[PDB]
Amino acid sequence: FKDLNLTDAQKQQIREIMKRPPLEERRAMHDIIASDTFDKVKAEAQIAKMEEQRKANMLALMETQNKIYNILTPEQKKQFNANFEKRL
Chain residues in the site for its own copies (CB under 8 A)? 26, 29-30, 32-38, 40, 43-44, 46-48, 50-51, 54-55, 58-59, 62-63, 65-67, 69-70, 77, 80-81, 84, 88
Closest to 31 (Cα-Cα) out of 56, 55, 49: 49
| 8 vs 31, beta carbon nearer its own copies | 31
The answer to whether the CB of 5 falls within 8 A of the CB of 78 is no
Q: How far is the C-alpha of 58 from the C-alpha of 11, rounded, in Å?
A: 22
6 to 45: interface string for Zn ion, x by CB under 5 A: ---------------------x--xx--xx---x-xx---
For residue 57, what are the CA distances in angstroms to 10, 14, 27, 63? 24, 18, 19, 10
Binding mask 12-51 for ligand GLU (x = CB under 6 A): -----------------------x---x--x---------
